[PDB]
Amino acid sequence: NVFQTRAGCLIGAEHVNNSYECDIPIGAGICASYQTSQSIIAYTMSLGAENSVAYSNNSIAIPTNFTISVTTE
């Protein structure tokens, strides 16, 4: 059970064909994470989580309601 990355031979984690957000960055896009029999897995990460916007030359989207957040820095 050994994986071959771009970064190097990664022993001890099972490749996964899903793609989730990054957890422990390894290299060349391969991010390991612990998710479950809970075994360290290594999987190509999703840059973001994909979206697509419906653009049409006459159509606009106006927020009807808002929030107020508070974000430490």
């Binding site: 606009i60 106006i62 927020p63 009807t64 808002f66 974000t71 430490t72 820095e73």
Partner: protein, 228 residues
Amino acid sequence: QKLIANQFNSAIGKIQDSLSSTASALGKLQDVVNQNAQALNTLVKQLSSNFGAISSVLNDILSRLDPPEAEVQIDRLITGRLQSLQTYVTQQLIRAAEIRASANLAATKMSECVLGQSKRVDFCGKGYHLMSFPQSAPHGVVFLHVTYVPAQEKNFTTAPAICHDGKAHFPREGVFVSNGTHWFVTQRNFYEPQIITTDNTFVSGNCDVVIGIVNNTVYDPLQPELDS
């Protein structure tokens, strides 16, 4: 006003538990301290190393040895222990210049984001910025950026002008929209439709050159005033 008070207040509360149960929120400040201590330790331990010299302690090289020994030995200590400083010093200067770069950033946020209202997008944190509350922390400052994030969308059909009499009209502030019958000028960042009268619009030229214009009756505030 009242709703907003709560959305404020609640948002205040969560911050506490975003802290009280999580120390890693302070990671930055937490590191700056560590890296400091992490230096001194690494610096201190350098006292123990022999740098090739035949003992760690100076006295025991002093005592045991004849000066023409001690001299040549004590150099290795010095030259080593010396060089250990220049490492430790340089690390500071380089590091202490980084802080200086992050101080000059706070002194900016303090000035712009607190004392003013910042127009710089995502300088004050994601979303339109409202105000900021500094809070002191050990060797560092913590800002509470109160930001305005819009929420619930509705699609609309929008057209950039209106031919009324064949002149155009463009909205003075914020877009035209329609929900499918009644065209509405509105302000952009919040949905507050309004019937379109001349105070909302300003004429420019005539139709054709506009691209996407749409018919409508642009209401006339005056005219009913003439019912007499």
